[PDB]
Design a protein around this ligand. Sequence first.
Ligand SMILES: [Zn+2]
Ligand SMILES: [Zn+2]
Ligand SMILES: [Zn+2]
Ligand SMILES: [Zn+2]
Lengths: 157, 155, 160, 157
Amino acid sequence: PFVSCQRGYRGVWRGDGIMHTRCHCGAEITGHVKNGTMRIVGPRTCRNMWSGTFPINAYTTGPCTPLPAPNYKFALWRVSAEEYVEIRRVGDFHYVSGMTTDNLKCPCQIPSPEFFTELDGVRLHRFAPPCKPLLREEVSFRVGLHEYPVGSQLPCE
Amino acid sequence: PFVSCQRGYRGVWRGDGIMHTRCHCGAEITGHVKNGTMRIVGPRTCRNMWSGTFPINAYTTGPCTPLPAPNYKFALWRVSAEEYVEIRRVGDFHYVSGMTTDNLKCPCQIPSPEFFTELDGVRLHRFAPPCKPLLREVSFRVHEYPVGSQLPCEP
Amino acid sequence: PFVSCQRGYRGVWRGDGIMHTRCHCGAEITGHVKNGTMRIVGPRTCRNMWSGTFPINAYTTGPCTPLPAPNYKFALWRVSAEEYVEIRRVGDFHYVSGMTTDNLKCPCQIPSPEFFTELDGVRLHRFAPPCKPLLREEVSFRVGLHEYPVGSQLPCEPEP
Amino acid sequence: FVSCQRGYRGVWRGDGIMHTRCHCGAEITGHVKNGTMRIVGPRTCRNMWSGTFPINAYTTGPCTPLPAPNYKFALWRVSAEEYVEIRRVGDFHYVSGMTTDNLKCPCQIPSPEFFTELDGVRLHRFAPPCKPLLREEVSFRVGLHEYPVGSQLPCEP
Ligand SMILES: [Zn+2]
Ligand SMILES: [Zn+2]
Ligand SMILES: [Zn+2]
Ligand SMILES: [Zn+2]
């Protein structure tokens, strides 16, 4: 139900200061982070203004970083320079629900939330590739050396 | 010998935990971070182990983040999906000494050291697309301005 | 393959100039200090030359002195005419966790980083006795008229 | 590091201490004893870690290189500003290219140390910039007879 006009991040921020981004509709949204809460200033027209959110793009600019909560439902993870992995979170456990390419080597511990490229459709980092179609069945990812099938939890929790 | 190993980063880190990476020479380097300091562990073969340094790669794994000292000489700023700028620092001012392409749009204010792609030869991000020859002979656009000029929101 | 390199100092120096020394593997290293920073030049053989570090032997030469950072773990303090004491440093507090001989006479104010003969395996001063084996258990050191056990803080140092 | 001028580690004639500077601009020193040169360098200059010695208008000392005759291509200054490439075949030499057409040439290929370059590696100082790299449809003048691009050095049996 988001019209992008891209889906903004709304949550805590790392650092204090003034942030600057441009939406896909054209808006320039300005953010004022102080004590880790950002106050948004934007045009009635952008959905992000309505949602209190702040889209992240090649256009983003300022000293601050997203500090999202660990209770996401899906996370796209940049593993190669051009390859990603979809993690699904269920309880305190995270399971590889998909991957751009097969035999995709990957780390075994899950990262802190702010290293993920996208959380539930929301971008976290100013630059990244596009995302090849996430294969979700009939596949395997290598973790170091021992391979696993799709759906299988990350081996370190 | 010394020659193929990536010039690693040595300095303060953000967040505690265990860092993993692989040097171009093939060596694996491990960094243990507590209170911002990283202790380096690696094979004798590799420079970074002797240098106390950590090579940031597409191979780097971990929770910690580099926190560079603001007192650099030169820095690489990724200002576009595929475009960079060399920023040279003199005292409290910084002067844009290079650019991969002429007339690239630019930001009027320098970022925190940590947002720079490379510092004095040390790459700080793990994913960084390659840098075409830097041009030091044209102009940039913030208005529009010749090479060597300070950052226009630094006057 | 692996040189027996006695590890060098890398850090800030006192007094600009040109310094020469010989390494344990007989690499005539030479350094150039300007504004505290020394730039090293030697052979691709020595492993100080992989770290970029200056070995301090009794071979060193020149008007510069090391100025080490204060956050060491273990230091070597030269007492006497032939005796040392390993000082172990925990945060702001300092313990006499070794010695080269029992019941050593031993001052109780722990010196500036500059004054230690060796800091965490790096010598700082050109001339030194060879260190005897470090007795670390069932021994004591005298701070003046008082006698204390191995593992004790310094007796000037405010320890609670 | 990658900007450094490829130097020479081979045998030297004479003994003593040699100085020169790289294009990177760390200076270099070689110590020659029994014909072997030891490289003392800045922990910045590839020629130090390569044990090589960059030969430049900046070199000084009392010693002269002696390359082994098992080179591939070489540079031969035949005039004040005119060189000639020479390809070794495992046999006897071949003139692989000039810098100017109808160039005059001595028929005997000289000992390895008279060449300005052996394989992209300078051996002499003050040698003039090479021009172009010309390959074909051109002739050289050995004695009074003339020869095509590609022929053996005449005086070789
Ligand atoms: Zn919008
Ligand atoms: Zn290495
Ligand atoms: Zn050595
Ligand atoms: Zn060089």
